[PDB]
Amino acid sequence: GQRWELALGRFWDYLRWVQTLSEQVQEELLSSQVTQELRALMDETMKELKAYKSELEEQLTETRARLSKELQAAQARLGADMEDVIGRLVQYRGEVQAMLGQSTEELRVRLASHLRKLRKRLLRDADDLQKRLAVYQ
Numbered sequence: 001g002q003r004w005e006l007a008l009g010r011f012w013d014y015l016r017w018v019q020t021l022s023e024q025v026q027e028e029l030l031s032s033q034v035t036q037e038l039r040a041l042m043d044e045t046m047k048e049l050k051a052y053k054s055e056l057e058e059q060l061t062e063t064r065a066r067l068s069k070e071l072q073a074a075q076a077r078l079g080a081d082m083e084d085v086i087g088r089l090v091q092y093r094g095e096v097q098a099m100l101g102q103s104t105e106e107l108r109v110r111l112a113s114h115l116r117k118l119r120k121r122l123l124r125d126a127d128d129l130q131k132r133l134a135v136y137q
């Protein structure tokens, strides 16, 4: 229940909703609302993660150099994963526009499948980051 974990949980819950591609999700995917709201949740997660690492550094027991660089890489992966999710949802909005009003059912099937894989990567990187934070502490 760290602050950054709760922020990530809000990003994660929002994204689990987007994954359903329900009527209201689809509406908000063609405006900028889903990507704006996800970006705000991503920014909060990253801000809290940075502050948490900064506070952990106050209670630390060449090895330090390596672990700090490894932790930085794991944080950067989490942020890139969230950016990749947002970018795929921006791509969807453009794909829909290019259809000129034709059915988007196939685009939605493909988006759902790809989102599942992006979410798997985000979750595995979150778990790796949490493990490194626990061992850093």
Ligand code: NA
Pocket (backbone or CB within 6 Å): 012, 013, 016
């Ligand atoms: Na959830």
Ligand code: NA
Pocket (backbone or CB within 6 Å): 103, 104, 105, 106, 107, 108
């Ligand atoms: Na389609």
